């Protein structure tokens, strides 16, 4: 489940599918277990909401059309990707994920609107 | 070259948070009938595998005393147990004037239990009948406003009403595997010298926890697991004497208890249909209920706990003392055994001391020395304080034995004074949170956050 | 949530992502609240069913290979799109949405079958 | 619902969308009906997990980059396709679906990593 | 008074056999055997499906 934990980002770039797959378990005993069985289903569809509305239909290595403002890390790509592991990373860049989500929203919606500029041209 | 933000899914990222938890049961309850006991019918079936998945480069914090899982299991056990007693008789027709026993034999030169008789609402409402039974002494109270000893009462009828645990259920500690719902991970601390707070440098993950024993026990943790290497000691902070101090043992001390009175079952009936059980005549000659521990084992283990206390108190030597007073539930070791509820005086296990000098106790010169604890018996269990308390444990026929292993001692540093250089420790009371927490320090449940963000040299098409 | 309500179609063409995002709330009290917690999750997956089977994987501005039969509106594109708003439009076009769903179903499935005609050609 | 059942594979290649659509019914009476109302929603999202992680975002006729090892059937394409109906096929091919799932997982993830190989070039 | 206790069926309820349609939740199919002399085991050669029984 968590073999990529701790290791560097490049090493962690694979086995992501194993980490995504594990959202299934159990049988019902009463209301509280049924509350556990609505489970991360709301969480899973919340992630699906976020990634689909960012144009990333399906779960993948989705890169975007928003440039990376260096003020979020101010660290080189190579020193980060080869050496850093995601935990302190998620702790640090938590200062910026929200405006990043907003930028992804507006960029994806603007790009989708621009599809009509070509999709009405053909 | 320019950089664009790239979102990664399937990341390992953690956040400690509260969450509902399954209950999963081992195989040793699925052979019974449904609901005999809950583990056979409600909790999901287990799986022995996967084992602990080692993690190469992890570094995780482990605060154990604030671990929510104790509360998520305290409320679980209170809700589960209090639902198990629902269908059984709610006694109520026993709060009756008990007019009973003749003179005691030889003024207490005997291991006494008291006989009493009483009027019951028989199968016809208004044609009540006389009946006789016997009870152990803690469950009878004098009634009369005067000195008169003729009339007696159950110890209830001043507290809340009661119910009888049905003969169908069993109290054996069927183990319970805790398993987090999908989307959460159980992280296991694996630092062999982990005290209870700070980090664990070697950490793993499991799908479901290995089975815990839910056994109720105050002063000694019966049938527990074992420390892998050595005796270890835990507290939220040793400076606070009021805090419970847990001790966990590597070598298991073997404890055997028995109640050799050949108590016999009797079946009174109450109103329509529903029976009520009580002790009939004892066949045989009565004898005290007691618990036995091997003396050399206890001496060696207590001295080793002495050195482990000296690891935190090298300035001072160690003594052990009797319990800190209070009522019956708090003073005495109380643990369940085959159907009864034993209560045992613990003085004879906490009268030694240690002053640096480890004596040549082992290997055994003569293994015949064994200490003995005098033990009382109860049926009216004021089980948890203010819960809907009094369960009536039905009396169980035939003589019983509960040969078991001790694995942990709950103690309290004395609330004394005078700057004693040989500070002394008493047995603690048991909050069952603390009993259960001692066997659950190894686990922590963490929220999985599989959405990721990072830079990468990409630019999608337009 | 609903800033686009009332305004004309073209003005309402943006902030769609905001109105799509809002499908999350609450904490459980008993069976009835848990019934509220299965929520529009069933509705959300119904919409996912409809739009995915119409080839629109990931909610977007999806235009299809079904010609717009003018009998459904018999109104020019510009007069509708610049001036009308979606409420009375939905009230009127309710006479035709069902056969439209059928046409979308058959058109998409026919197109997907025709993928094999090229996807088995390469 | 099941018009394609029994008939051969080629005839069954259509009306698949009808069989995909039917995952909706009911109103709540207590815990057990609510347990029925979490329904195949877990099954539906399990299928979504499987087919989305295999790159098939939005259920379709999805062919993959894994060659068909003939040891799984050792039967010609035409004889299977024009004549066989799926039930005994699923009974027989059950001996191989699991390693097929593994192969689809690794093949799709390797292909997805190669998106960065190409798309870092632009 | 020798067996368990009792309760009185209220006058509000009725014992008339109101019919019940068994219906499977979405994702499952009710299959009906239609062989006019199906004895009770073995195959049924003519079979259908229904939304609810
Ligand atoms: C806990 O405490 C409770 C009480 O709080 C104890 O339970 C009670 O104990 C009482 C004392 O033992 C016992 O009382 C009995 O009364 C019987 C009389 O019954 C009457 O009522 C019934 C009901 O309506 C009528 O049907 C019946 O006809 C009577 O009117 C006595 O019979 C009992 O005594 C017998 O045993 C003792 C020995 O212990 C003898 O000394 C005595 O004589 C009785 O034995 C004769 O009778 C039996 C038949 O019962 C004959 O089979 C036997 O041979 C004896 O015969 C004599 O007579 C013949 C000629 O007929 C003669 O030739 C021969 O030599 C004999 O002399 C007893 O006294 C209560 O019933 C009981 N409670 C209940 C609910 O039962 C309980 O024990 C305590 N427990 C403990 C562990 O401490
Ligand atoms: C009720 O009380 C009685 C009397 O106290 C009690 O019976 C005794 O139990 C002990 C329990 O240990 C018995 O101890 C023996 O210990 C020897 C070791 O010296 C063992 O080898 C014995 O067991 C094995 O060997 C037996 C053949 O010799 C086998 O039949 C047995 O299955 C084992 O393989 C044995 O345990 C002691 O012998 C008995 N009897 C007496 C007279 O003491 C009884 O157990 C109590 N009831 C309950 C339910 O505990």
Residue numbers in the entry:
A (entry chain B), C (entry chain G), D (entry chain L): 522 to 547, 569 to 664
B (entry chain A): 32 to 139, 150 to 185, 185A, 185B, 186 to 309, 312 to 321, 321C, 322 to 354, ...
E (entry chain K): 196 to 248
Direct quotes from the study:
The HIV-1 Env is a trimer of gp120-gp41 heterodimers that are heavily shielded from the host immune systems by N-linked glycosylation and further protected from neutralization by conformational masking and considerable sequence variability. A glycosylated region near the base of the third variable loop (V3) of HIV-1 Env forms a supersite of vulnerability that is targeted by antibodies originating from diverse germline genes in multiple HIV-1 infected individuals. Here, we determine structures of antibodies in complex with HIV-1 Envelope for all observed members and ancestral states of the broadly neutralizing HIV-1 V3-glycan targeting DH270 antibody clonal B cell lineage. Here we used cryo-EM to visualize the interactions of a complete inferred DH270 clonal tree with the co-evolving virus Env.
The I4 clade leads to mature antibodies DH270.2 and DH270.3. The I4 clade mature antibody DH270.2 acquired mutations focused on cluster 1, improving interactions at the N332-glycan D1 arm in a manner similar to the I3 intermediate. While DH270.3 mutations optimized interactions with the N301-glycan, the DH270.2 mutations focused instead on the D1 arm N332-glycan interaction. Of the three heavy chain mutations R98K, W101Y, and D115N, the D115N mutation showed the clearest shift in interaction. Loss of the negative charge at D115N allowed the asparagine side chain to shift away from the positively charged K98 by ~1.6 Å (D and N Cγ to R Nε or K Cε) to form an extensive hydrogen bonding network with the N332-glycan D1 arm. This mirrored the R98T mutation in I3, where D115 was freed from its interaction with the positively charged VH residue R98 to engage the N332-glycan. Downstream maturation from I4 to DH270.2 suggests this was not an ideal solution to acquiring N332-glycan interaction, as DH270.2 acquires mutations like those in I3 for the N332-glycan D1 arm. Maturation of I4 to DH270.2 involved acquiring mutations proximal to the N332-glycan D1 arm like those in I3, suggesting that engaging the D1 arm rather than the D2/3 arm was a better solution to optimizing N332-glycan interaction. The greater breadth of the DH270.2 antibody compared to DH270.3 is likely a combined effect of improvement in the N332-glycan interaction in DH270.2 and the Y27S reversion in DH270.3.
